[PDB]
Symmetry: D2
Subunit: 383 residues, 4 copies
């Protein structure tokens, strides 16, 4: 039992924090105001190491564990205001790079993986459908086996990075008899005949992180573009979501550390009735809640990632961390706004934008109600 980072981990965190502050946070306000995802800046971040994670040196990666990867992402969330870009980059890492590395054939990895790890190519993960959100294994897109590969039809929605992606990691049914056991995963390139990528659909939350629908109209998928074995697509999706929930969520821990520092400074400086507003217990009690939340969810995050790195079953731990981080990120965003009062409306300071950016954290990679269902199942309550 030890609660210090190693020297190596401290160096990883500090280097990522410096890059986030000195590279990505530069001119963030202009990109945020204009709703710009700068692909050239995204690629520099990818190549720095944010697209690497556990990938081996063979493919340009850093062989990091889950805890190391989470520390880099926590630093990114604390140091850069451009959380939409950070979310886009981390989705590419956790839901696209990592499954290709963990399950792709040698041929597929040799063709695509280093390009994704360096950001030469941007990827999008396409699983969710109009009638398959939480009930993902109800997906209806079909990859019908045929001579030489598959014929793919269907529609995916809510696809982060789709408007800017060069490749798509898609999940579809190769056996409509089954749910989970009937899904396979495939890599398809932008421009393939029959792949219709929709225009960006605007949103107020994470507003410069592009998403859109994609429609498959009779796409031919060559056999060599299947990721993993036939029917393994549910397991591949599940594994990718463990990585996304475990490490991507660290963004919001770093964002909460930043928010709490801003909120503490204001509560010490702003005076009403002849005293700092932090001296009123209505004000300080909320700030203490923010502090309590930050410390608890950071420890839960670190333990979930450490358990994964030890080879232990961390599924419940990752569901608990994803739930706590996202709940605490939203609640603390509300508490920071309450601390500032009318001053919270300022768009430069961005407290309201911060709350908006935290709202989807309770939805992405499985809603928090679904996290409770996962934990309930691990506790024996779904037998």
């Amino acid at each position: 039992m030890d609660f210090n980072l190693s020297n190596s981990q401290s160096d990883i965190y500090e280097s990522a924090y410096r890059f986030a502050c000195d590279v990505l946070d530069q001119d963030a306000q202009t990109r945020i105001s204009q709703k710009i995802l700068s692909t050239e800046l995204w690629k520099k971040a990818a190549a720095y190491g944010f697209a690497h994670g556990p990938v081996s040196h063979q493919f340009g990666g850093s062989e990091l564990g889950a805890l190391d990867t989470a520390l880099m992402i926590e630093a990114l969330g604390k140091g850069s205001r451009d959380i939409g870009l950070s979310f886009s980059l981390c989705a590419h890492l956790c839901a696209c790079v990592i499954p290709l590395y963990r399950f792709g054939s040698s041929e597929l990895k040799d063709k695509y993986l280093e390009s994704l790890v360096t950001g030469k190519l941007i990827a999008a993960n396409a699983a969710t459908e109009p009638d398959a959100g939480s009930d993902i294994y109800n997906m209806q897109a079909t990859a019908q086996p045929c001579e030489g590969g598959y014929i793919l039809n269907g529609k995916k929605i809510f696809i982060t990075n789709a408007p800017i992606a060069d490749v798509f990691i898609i999940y579809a049914k190769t056996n409509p008899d089954h749910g989970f056991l009937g899904v396979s995963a495939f890599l398809i390139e932008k421009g393939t005949p029959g792949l219709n990528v929709g225009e960006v659909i605007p949103k107020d939350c994470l507003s410069n992180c592009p998403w859109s629908e994609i429609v498959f109209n009779d796409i031919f998928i060559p056999q060599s573009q299947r990721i993993g074995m036939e029917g393994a697509g549910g397991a591949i999706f599940h594994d990718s979501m463990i990585w996304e929930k475990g490490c991507l969520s660290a963004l919001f821990v770093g964002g909460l550390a930043r928010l709490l520092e801003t909120t503490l400074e204001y509560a010490k400086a702003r005076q009403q009735f002849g005293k700092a507003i932090g001296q009123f217990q209505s004000v300080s009690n909320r700030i203490i809640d923010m502090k309590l939340r930050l410390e608890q969810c950071r420890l839960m995050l670190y333990r979930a990632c450490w358990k994964h790195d030890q080879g232990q079953d961390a599924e419940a731990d990752i569901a608990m961390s994803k739930l706590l981080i996202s709940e605490y990120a939203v609640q603390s965003g509300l508490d920071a706004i309450q601390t500032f009062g009318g001053a919270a409306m300022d768009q430069e300071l961005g407290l309201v934008r911060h709350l908006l950016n935290m709202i989807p954290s309770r939805i992405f990679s499985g809603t928090n109600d679904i996290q409770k269902e996962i934990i309930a199942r691990k506790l024996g309550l779904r037998g």
Copy 2:
């Protein structure tokens, strides 16, 4: 003890609801998207009766009580998506029309009141300052008595309607010896020398409801433009805030009724795992919270306004209603977003915009921490 509306009250509510749906809600999505406050549409709403409240027939008003006025505003909040326009109109009524009617001289009312009641003129209330928010009686703007009236200097911030107002109801110290007893109220016209109205300052919440700063540089206020007696400005401000907290807050009760209907319809229609999502208790428990909140805060609102109409001391009741409505409006906005999941990001449906519009309700007219301080004082805990 009776919980029905009278026939007259039902007619007032239904007429206001029809106007909100059939006039104001028409083309609201375009104005919301473009961040437009249509002054011509605002004036039609004012003249319909939303700028009338308790004003007598002599000045074009309807002699409504607080409960009647709140019902009209509740209908407005349920029927029109353009809550920024509705907030702007209700601020003009509660913080400008009503104090002028209740405290202005015959001469001032004869010159200005009917124009404000018909919306011929738009008014803004200017009390808050950089160093006087919750601690309003710390305001530093000074109206120094001089031959013929006053010399006014100072700065006001967060002033709803300032960029579009023709007249300003301003509060300033006529005696810097005192706080509350040292404030007077004045009506000043747009264009008076020394009145510098700032450009609109954008915000994400209530985004088409304009606000800005105003600076007074050596303005001469003629004696006849003082509203009420010298030093009564604190009492006038206080009375105006009772009306704003009591009736303007009804907007958010009507908005919660609308939100709950939308949320119920979706939870019945959207299916996952082979059933409507409303069949999962994680989903329905939040919707029941929304229902419980709506019923409780509507009754608290109605009782506060009824008590005022009976001539009873309703200050604690109004503080309790303002606190409950705004807390419940924010919490229910969060719960509706959670019900919809990724579907909540759609900008046309506007669930995220609705949450943004509810966030300032816990701040305007006195924060909810200040409402607790008012209630504490009424309960004898601040002696």
Copy 3:
């Protein structure tokens, strides 16, 4: 819309309050300490009017509506510390007297009803079973039709008043083919062969309100002791629970009014750090929550009972009031303890005992989770 009591209602409340203070609360501390239910005192309360409710003058009652009955019970909850006795009396009224009056034949009412209304006889309602709590229509006790009546077998648990009852209102299946439509209700006398009333089972909550199990071993029920029609027992039980949830819950509104007055007095009188503890916002914020809860749940209670008296469908309103009153009674008990600190441990003052007495309010007459299921069904979420 009116929020005053009538003169008649004010008189009912005040007379009940005086009886609760001047009769029942006398020597309550001794009975509470010794865990005594004084049947002679219970009978005086019954005869005063607490066993009357809506029963007609023909049978000794007062023809009160639900709101009148709730006011009497609210006064009882505020004026008497002996809430175990009050709960016992109100269970007899709402679950035994009222169904016999509403559904019993002329012959059964002529034999028993006036005796129950005067408290000459004490009754217990026996519905719950080991395997039928929330799922009450799963009850397994059987009243098998036979020549002359029925043969009754089964076991009931959690039966308030069973150790002191002279008569039992029992629910059992007359058709094991059905659930709700298969239940009938019967009145059986203490001492009937085969009726085995268990010894009192102690509890820490409502500790002097006796309950026990009852076992039926081949009881013969004569035909004339069926209450209502064959198979109407589910409807009779349901109606009785509407009365119990609607009016019995008023006990806890009166108890919260008493608790809040005690808590306010202490927060003004107790000083630490040179000021009354009510001046610290951590302390006052909880007391304001208690006040907000009291006002909201009293209005919800009154509206539910008024709607019933108007002949409107009040089922959702009664479920909402039962849920809010019991949740707020428990939360406010916790908040009063927090206000007093170590002083809350005093057994004479009884703040901890008060919390214990409120704990079962979230369980009796249907748990609060079941109240949410009822409200969900009324909102169309259980179709």
Copy 4:
């Protein structure tokens, strides 16, 4: 960063757990029912090691750190239902043994310390007064210096173990000019002239853990019985409370682990409506809250104790852990009762007694409002 116990720590926990189950939990139900604190059993627990903590081998101790000591206490809280005895023992360790070891002279330690570490003698800590609870440095008891020592007068209340203690660690003012700097600490023996120990005062929470008032009437304290330096009594008290809040609170973490296991088993076994009640999300969502709380507060506890063992400033960490453990212990007690419904009233199972035992955890060693004030001060909000 590592989240495993060492082999030594696992052995400490497991040995303490076995002793708690196989020695202390034996016949606990009888002692709980009769409100008995068995001093002979208490002494066996003390001698086993529960009175040792950090005390050196010289005095019979085990030289444990704070984390080791907390693990032993967590095991005690999980393994023994007799939490009143466990609280009594841990108060003696943390508030009496530890300050004597850390601050007492060689002469005082040689006379008393090994006897306290073996439980040969029981000690009580007497700091709180009628007018000095949270505001402890307002204590009014006076130890007036005189020839040969001090004359002690005053009154202490809420003193755990006073009715059974052989020695008292008392705090009193040696300089009524100052608060914190004016307090000194002393050891006095039962039977000293002028020491009047009150009779046990009963309570419903921790009901077999005796407490009482003590009155000092002109007690002569010889100079050699002062613990530490003159005026160091505030620092000694503060240090003792760090140990009590840091390690004694582990009792409630172990109790929550036990409660959660009991609650999970019931939610799997109890069926209504044809399924285990754990399958209803209203039920499982609360159990998941219990699980989330247990994991978070155990990690916060372990980190606070580890930081203390590393020589770091752990004051904020200990205040955060004491607050979270006690809040989560109370909330989880409420949630377990809600899970069981009417079955929670059973006195043998003791769910209601468990809630009662957790209620004072939010008060002892400083209320949770005071913990927030400590954290606020550490965050710079009390400057």
